[PDB]
Design a protein around this motif. Structure first.
Motif, short mmCIF file in Angstrom:
data_model
loop_
_atom_site.label_atom_id
_atom_site.label_comp_id
_atom_site.label_asym_id
_atom_site.label_seq_id
_atom_site.Cartn_x
_atom_site.Cartn_y
_atom_site.Cartn_z
N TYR A 1 -58.39 60.26 51.75
CA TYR A 1 -57.62 61.24 51.00
C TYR A 1 -58.44 61.87 49.89
O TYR A 1 -58.82 61.20 48.92
N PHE A 2 -58.65 63.20 49.99
CA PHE A 2 -59.37 64.06 49.06
C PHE A 2 -58.39 64.80 48.17
O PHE A 2 -57.21 64.98 48.51
N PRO A 3 -58.86 65.24 46.99
CA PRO A 3 -57.97 65.91 46.05
C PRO A 3 -57.39 67.20 46.63
O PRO A 3 -58.00 67.87 47.47
N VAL B 138 -63.36 71.40 49.28
CA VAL B 138 -63.08 70.18 48.52
C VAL B 138 -64.01 69.07 48.97
O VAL B 138 -64.57 68.34 48.14
N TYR C 11 -66.37 60.52 42.92
CA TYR C 11 -65.97 61.47 41.90
C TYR C 11 -65.92 62.87 42.50
O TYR C 11 -66.78 63.26 43.30
N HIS C 12 -64.86 63.59 42.19
CA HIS C 12 -64.69 64.98 42.56
C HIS C 12 -65.34 65.84 41.47
O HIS C 12 -65.54 65.38 40.35
N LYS D 276 -73.34 64.57 48.60
CA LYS D 276 -73.75 63.33 47.92
C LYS D 276 -74.02 62.21 48.92
O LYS D 276 -75.02 61.48 48.80
N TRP D 277 -73.12 62.03 49.89
CA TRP D 277 -73.19 60.84 50.74
C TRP D 277 -74.31 60.87 51.76
O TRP D 277 -74.59 59.84 52.37
N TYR E 157 -60.13 61.92 41.82
CA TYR E 157 -60.98 61.00 42.57
C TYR E 157 -60.69 61.11 44.05
O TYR E 157 -59.56 61.41 44.46
N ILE E 158 -61.75 60.91 44.84
CA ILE E 158 -61.68 60.87 46.30
C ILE E 158 -61.41 59.43 46.71
O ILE E 158 -62.13 58.51 46.28
#
Ligand code: 1XK
Ligand code: 1XK
Ligand code: PRO
Ligand code: PRO
Ligand code: CA
Ligand code: CA
Ligand code: CA
Ligand code: CA
Ligand code: CA
Ligand code: CA
Ligand code: CA
Ligand code: CA
Ligand code: CA
Ligand code: CA
Ligand code: CL
Ligand code: CL
Ligand code: CL
Ligand code: ZN
Ligand code: ZN
Lengths: 499, 488
Positions: free
Chosen positions: A64-66, A112, B27-28, A119-120, B34-35
């Motif tokens: 779940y993402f913002p 999003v 971190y978003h 990053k990952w 937050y993710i």
């Protein structure tokens, strides 16, 4: 009593009556916002359970993402934002306090998620990344909404995968599309046409888009039921999703990406395809309640001891069915007549009504009434588990076969503009030889609107492309011309009036 | 090669490193959001599985209501709106087009759902209404956010029930509170204190609030785990949720309503309670992966015969554990070392690591390593199924026993303000005789300073209030023992 709106007269009012009297939808006080009541949400849950299991087999994981995007992230892929920007909803304050920066509600989550992917991913072994999420998105169009089919807020699944190689990504696009076709065809009993979207209709910022198209015979219109995009490297280059491979030392390589999505539009298409003038009709595979048990013929005369025996026999059937994994409800409430129950559960489209009267109870038998055809059967008590299962399986097959027949007679080939126009005005969708260019697709829309011969109940609109079928009805003759006449045709393309 | 920050030193930095190196949180780019990566999301799904099933047994049904609410609907219950207004996020335009009327994002769905409830209740026979939804809400506070525990957007479940009689509603409030205590105690191995919120701390717009309180000893602070409110008739008189009395013709009655919520704060408390200086520690009941199988001892020396036999032995442990409904992963990847894997799954808190090297395969045995204690066990091959399940259950028991001892250690009684203050700066939570008045609760907070706040009035206090005790303020007689402490 029941439904009195008739489907072949005013489709829009029939649709609204069915979705409300079946207790699927309630209207919210904000336009284009609709409440999903339990009877509809359970269908979404049946879809969810199946699709979740299938993509888990492929290595996809839920997360779940913002729900918010920054203006900076939203604008990094210029094609994508140019397409979505007019309908992005913006939050600008909290209480009366202005925010640090306006932030956007996700219309879709590419912008999003992909800074996180950047990053990952550092090394070739950090790929693939395969994430999915079940969430809501918001697309704030000012055109007229329609429940389930075209709404400002909707529930969906969106999958996002990132791969080191184009081969892997390409493979996934089609595996996911096959699952979407299974959702429509195996669960919802709706036939679909798989294909590639034309250049005009493909996802903005994607390499190519694949789709499943369904046909709504009551309308003559087709609708896109689900979508699987190959984004290529268009987002990884803009979000810096890069890895380094020791095979190619020093050079940073951009990930190959897909996204794919399926919404509660599914439930609207099932409503449009299978519903009749008695109300909703549920395919047994997604029906919240597959069998409803209703105790019949109870009068004032019935002995109290006899009455208790009847309610107990109905609960007997309920437990037998629960034990064979048939979803079942015993409508035992005293405060409604048998006829009112018959009508209530018909409006909601329950596949089988199980009637138990004192006479049948004492004769160790019962009555099963199928919803799709209204046919009735007397069944011996000892066979309940067996025959009910079979009737459920037949109902599912029948619903699909009917819908398949409609598709087969409403989708045909035409090889000239004139034949295309005529066949299209008779309420069908047509495979035509097509040059593929966006300008010709605009010209097709404009002139099939202009030259339309109106059949009495038909929609007044231009024809749009639906998909380039993977398996066209016919093979393109060598050197065939597009319907525009001036360019060679590249492929057969499905065209119709659409949502 | 894993965790460097120590839990007993800067806790906030420990927390940040545990939640990122266990791959739970990202971190978003918007500050404060937050993710939830798959490792965290899977815990939320375990909680949902249990809780969904239980409330379905109670007659509750899932639905989905809009995320947006209008100005006029939001302000109909004055107490409730006043409490939430400063944190409501407002949409004011789509694209560049300013909206005709700003619309709000739900901080909670009472004012979204209850107009519809008023439409749906036509008669006594339309009750009860029992609806739940799994969804996201936004509470845009400008204070400092903390992953899981206090966030501007979070996933939850919110249940909303309307009944004809208060007796039904009252029963449900406590049934739900019991399910919340089961999530925390049976699933997360976290002990909790059930109680009622004081007048000051109860849900704005409700009559009373039942709660479950957990204790994070690394912090000395308590946290509200989950809440079940009886809204009484406060909302149905504002939104006109009415039915005619079946016996008095003409007389309209207002429905009695509850609402209850549980959020991903759960995961955060689980991390704060059970985590150690090696990283996350998962209770087996919610662990995505309960047993990770790791092949060891592969070298360039080892023959292809031996390597392929070793991999096959790993897959046969995988099959046998799947067979007994143990959630197992075989980590057979060749492009990661065994040490990297030991570290990876330790940081993620996998309850049992199952090591198989070539000599162990040739001895018909394997090594099981418990995450919680670090103990290594050698297990004969034929005992794999029964032994591993034993250990899993022991892990769940051990995590709960330690935490329970902790709460018994840090929750004590005091009857004066002097010892209340001593025991409070002791890093503990205190049950004290309380008058229940709001002015005195403001006073306790002002004196204790971070000031202590009330947490719950325990259902089962540690001591019976001895007749005529006076509250710690001194002016008035106490009405109940009340749990107090510094709070998240
Ligand atoms: C439920 C849903 C599904 C999909 N789509 C699109 C993608 C897809 C394809 O399968 C799936 C995700 C992959 C799907 O399901 C698109 C919309 C939608 O565009 N909503 C905005 C909106 C609001 C509104 F009030 C009116 C209109 C509108 C548009 N034309 N007219 C005459 C009215 C549009 N809504
Ligand atoms: C995840 C979550 C859970 C709960 N709640 C409350 C109810 C309950 C407990 O039972 C459950 C629903 C029933 C729960 O879990 C409340 C919040 C929250 O108020 N968020 C807003 C916010 C954002 C922010 F950036 C900072 C702060 C903040 C506040 N103080 N400080 C020092 C910082 C607050 N968030
Ligand atoms: O909006 C779309 O069509 C793609 C697929 C789901 C995520 N974004
Ligand atoms: O926010 C709360 O505390 C209540 C319970 C969930 C819905 N509203
Ligand atoms: Ca239902
Ligand atoms: Ca466009
Ligand atoms: Ca657009
Ligand atoms: Ca389109
Ligand atoms: Ca050209
Ligand atoms: Ca005509
Ligand atoms: Ca996982
Ligand atoms: Ca407040
Ligand atoms: Ca009166
Ligand atoms: Ca009255
Ligand atoms: Cl009607
Ligand atoms: Cl802000
Ligand atoms: Cl026709
Ligand atoms: Zn052309
Ligand atoms: Zn006092």
């Amino acid at each position: 009593l029941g439904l009195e709106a008739k489907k072949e007269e005013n489709l829009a009012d029939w649709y609204s009556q069915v979705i409300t009297k079946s207790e699927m939808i309630e209207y919210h006080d904000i336009s284009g916002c609709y409440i999903l009541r339990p009877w509809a949400y359970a269908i979404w849950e049946a879809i969810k359970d199946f699709f979740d299991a299938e993509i888990k087999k492929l290595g996809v994981e839920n997360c779940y993402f913002p729900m918010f995007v920054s203006q900076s992230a939203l604008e990094k892929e210029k094609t994508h934002v140019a397409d979505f920007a007019p309908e992005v909803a913006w939050v600008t304050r909290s209480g009366k306090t202005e925010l640090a920066e306006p932030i956007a509600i996700r219309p879709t989550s590419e912008t999003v998620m992909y800074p996180a992917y950047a990053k990952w991913v550092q090394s070739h072994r950090d790929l693939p990344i395969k994430l999915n999420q079940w969430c809501n998105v918001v697309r704030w169009e000012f055109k007229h909404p329609q429940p389930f089919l075209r709404t400002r807020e909707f529930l969906w699944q969106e999958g996002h995968s990132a791969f080191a190689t184009m081969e892997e990504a390409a493979e996934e696009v089609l595996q996911i599309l096959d699952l979407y076709a299974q959702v429509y065809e195996e669960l919802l009993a709706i036939p679909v046409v798989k294909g590639r979207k034309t250049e005009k209709e493909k996802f903005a910022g994607g390499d190519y888009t694949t789709t499943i198209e369904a046909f709504i015979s009551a309308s003559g219109r087709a609708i896109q039921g689900g979508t699987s995009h190959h984004l290529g490297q268009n987002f990884s280059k803009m979000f810096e999703i890069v890895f380094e491979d020791p095979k190619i030392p020093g050079e940073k390589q951009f990930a190959y990406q897909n996204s794919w999505g399926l919404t509660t539009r599914t439930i609207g298409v099932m409503t449009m395809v299978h519903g009749d003038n008695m109300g909703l009709v549920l395919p047994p595979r997604v029906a919240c309640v597959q069998v409803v048990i209703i105790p019949c013929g109870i009068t004032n005369a019935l002995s109290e001891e006899d009455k208790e025996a009847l309610i107990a026999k109905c609960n007997d059937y309920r437990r037998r069915l629960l034990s064979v994994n048939i979803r079942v409800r015993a409508d035992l409430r005293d405060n409604y007549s048998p006829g009112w129950k018959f009508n209530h559960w018909e409006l909601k489209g329950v596949p089988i009504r199980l009637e138990v009267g004192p006479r049948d109870m004492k004769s160790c038998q019962f009555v099963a009434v199928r919803r799709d055809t209204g046919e009735k059967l007397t069944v011996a008590e000892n066979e309940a588990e067996t025959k009910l299962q079979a009737i459920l399986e037949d109902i599912q097959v029948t619903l699909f076969t009917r819908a398949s027949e409609d598709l087969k007679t409403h989708m045909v080939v035409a090889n000239t503009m004139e034949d295309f126009q005529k066949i299209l005005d008779s309420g069908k969708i047509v495979q035509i030889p097509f040059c593929g260019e966006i300008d010709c697709e605009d010209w097709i829309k404009k002139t099939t609107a202009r030259d339309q011969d109106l059949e009495p109940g038909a929609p007044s609109m231009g024809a749009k492309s639906l998909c380039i079928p993977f398996k066209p009805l016919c093979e393109l003759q060598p050197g065939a011309k597009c319907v525009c006449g001036k360019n060679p045709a590249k492929y057969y393309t499905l065209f119709g009036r659409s949502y």
